[PDB]
Amino acid sequence: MKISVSKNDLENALRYLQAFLDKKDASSIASHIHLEVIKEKLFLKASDSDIGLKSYIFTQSSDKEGVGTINGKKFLDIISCLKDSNIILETKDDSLAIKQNKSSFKLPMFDADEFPEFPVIDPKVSIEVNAPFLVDAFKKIAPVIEQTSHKRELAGILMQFDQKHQTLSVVGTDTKRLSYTQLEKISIHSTEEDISCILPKRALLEILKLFYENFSFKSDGMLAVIENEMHTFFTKLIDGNYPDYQKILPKEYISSFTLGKEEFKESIKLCSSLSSTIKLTLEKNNALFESLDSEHSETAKTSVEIEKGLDIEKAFHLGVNAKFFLEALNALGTTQFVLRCNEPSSPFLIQESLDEKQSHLNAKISTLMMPITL
Amino acid sequence: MKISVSKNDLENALRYLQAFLDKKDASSIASHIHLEVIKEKLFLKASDSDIGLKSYIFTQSSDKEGVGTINGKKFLDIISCLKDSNIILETKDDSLAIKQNKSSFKLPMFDADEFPEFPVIDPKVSIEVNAPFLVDAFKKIAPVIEQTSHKRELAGILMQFDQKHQTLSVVGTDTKRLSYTQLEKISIHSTEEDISCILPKRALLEILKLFYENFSFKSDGMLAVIENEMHTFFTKLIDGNYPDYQKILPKEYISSFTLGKEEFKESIKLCSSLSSTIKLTLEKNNALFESLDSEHSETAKTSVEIEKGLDIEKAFHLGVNAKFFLEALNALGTTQFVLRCNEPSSPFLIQESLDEKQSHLNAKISTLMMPITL
Ligand SMILES: C[C@H](C(=O)O)c1ccc2c(c1)[nH]c1ccc(Cl)cc12
Ligand SMILES: C[C@H](C(=O)O)c1ccc2c(c1)[nH]c1ccc(Cl)cc12
């Protein structure tokens, strides 16, 4: 191989690749990036049985095509220390030479055949994502999912496609809260009417770094492959039977309250200075907040006026987990929210104000949460 | 006690105080700040046998004078969550009440008599620091000092006062490098012609957060007390016999080279991507840099043109520790530096370009460093 490339193009590609390297043992090919120069592109890949990324940059010049490997961390550390002007990469046996005016480096290459082949699938489902709504869903639902969950299928996000009705339902839960959205009018191409994919949390986080809009999502029910102009990503899927989220959602709610999002955030954060759980009291024209699990001589209280009166007689009391309630608020796009309740001992819902209205470049995420007793 | 205070004044004071609290065991008075309201001031202190801080803020109103205590971390966490408008602090038995419009808190106070008395000294030496030169010295020399040094007197910075000659010499070493400056024309008030104070590294770091200029420094040879308008700080001194730094500095240097500071930083950083130590080669019109301790198939090289020729025949070679050499450069205020050498196996000096010229609001820090053999 012998090429010249743009310093900034190469730095960028390498930063994205760092997440897919096992960097600690530099002696192992798991710390290296595979390189391949073909027809005016440098392809760079790092991969695994269960997750991987392939990218390319255009070569400024390309003189010798072929393949090789290089330690990814060291490569990125060298290139980040050079000026913003072309870099020459050239093999010299089982070594890669890096050159930029007076600065020169040599790093060892490993056998390129030891690199795992980058997998390709025959898709059973596919979509073109032309707007940010899916990543928006991903980002808003991610905090409810535990990556190190000892329960296998909850350690990822559900994507549930309905070809019939052109919907993609997206769901996360950790058993204490469950956040979901149903995306409308998605042109789904599928060999099945209804198909489901559970994506590991770790892949979800990597997707949020790589993709925003204008990408394809394709799955064979075993791997998902996500692709845009410069990147191909893949992940193993989690093995299956995601819980029936539809069965767990309440059918109706005794009470529905429209409440101020930012005033509830500030009030909850304030009380959480001394407690992880809060007693919320709703009256007609007031919301009161009190630390609940505080140490017994430590107390935080606040309140907020509700100008447009709630439909309450006396007072409804609800124990909440502060962090979870805030995360539910953080996932909302509106200035107000709706809190839907049944008994104080049963799960309650948090959603956007006017949640039926249809929005094209944002998802609308609802959260069901289990209350704290008392 | 019952006062009202400014939210921002109180937040600031509390942040500075966090460093002097043992925060993990909330049940111990070592996690609390002592409070005392006298004559339109709230005094806040946190202290130890060996280090401490006392601050004050003005009260907006003061109704009941007295004393109390409060958990410092919790207090700061509450106040950081309130609006930028007055806060009422009021005792209610062995509890402190905090109130701001609709928001109210209670925290437990401990017995104020269990708080250690804040020490006062009869000074043997004293100065008024009216400019940033001393903190500038502190900041530039601090990186060479190991706080967890198993050698007692090297775990701090030397301050060596000469009443006769109105100088304050300031020195740090970790045995591999030694950085020093001698500050001129300091009005020293002392009962001795020559006196020395070794300040612990930990106190040095706290001083850099609290003080800049317009402060007094006073010592009895056992504690140092540093004071400005709003703060009194103290520290135990380290017990003594700081090494004779003057004896360890070479008398003359065979070679002195004026070299480019920023070009040497970039070159060293670049080579340090693969190695902690570097081979520097100086020729007449070039400086060459090569990684030295790199893994044997990994190599970094660069060079820089020296336009105004050095006074060299063939080439001088010097092994350096990259991190130390950079820290020595970082401590300099000029665009160029002077590198003074004897044999490549002996210590070499790094100083500012034109180091004799006298500068009033910056210190000039020189660094002696032991080379790496080969
Ligand atoms: C079936 C699955 C499981 O038990 O792991 C499951 C997962 C999440 C929930 C649940 C049951 N039952 C629930 C009730 C309320 C909420 Cl917020 C979440 C859940
Ligand atoms: C006396 C003291 C010690 O041995 O601990 C000491 C401390 C620092 C140095 C030294 C001797 N001899 C040296 C030679 C060079 C340098 Cl940079 C520092 C030192």
Numbering used by the authors:
A (entry chain A), B (entry chain A): 2 to 375
What does the literature reporting this entry say, word for word?
Among them one such target is β-clamp. β-clamp, a part of DNA pol III holoenzyme is very crucial protein as it is involved in myriads of steps during DNA replication. It is the key protein that increases the processivity of many important enzymes and complexes by interacting with them. β-clamp prevents the polymerase from dissociating, while polymerase’s rapid movement along the DNA molecule. Biological active form of β-clamp is dimer and each monomeric unit consists of three domains, where the protein-binding site resides in between domain II and III. This interaction site is divided into two subsites and all β-clamp interacting partners bind to these subsites.
All of the five molecules showed competitive binding with ligase and three of them were co-crystallized and determined the complex structure with Hpβ-clamp to show that they bind to the ligase binding site/protein-protein interaction site. In case of (S)-carprofen, Thr154 of Ecβ-clamp makes H-bond with the ligand along with other hydrophobic contacts however in H. pylori the contact between β-clamp and ligand is favored by only hydrophobic interactions. Five of these interactions are common in both, which includes residues Lys151, Thr175, Pro243, Ile248, Met370 in Hpβ-clamp and Arg152, Gly174, Pro242, Val247, Met362 in Ecβ-clamp. Hpβ-clamp residue Thr173 form hydrogen bond with every docked inhibitor, while residue Lys247 hydrogen bonded the docked inhibitors (S)-carprofen. Out of five shortlisted drug molecules 6-Nitroindazole (C2), (S)-Carprofen (C3), and 5-Nitroindole (C4) displayed poor inhibitory activity on the growth of H. pylori, which may have been due to their inability to diffuse into the pathogen.
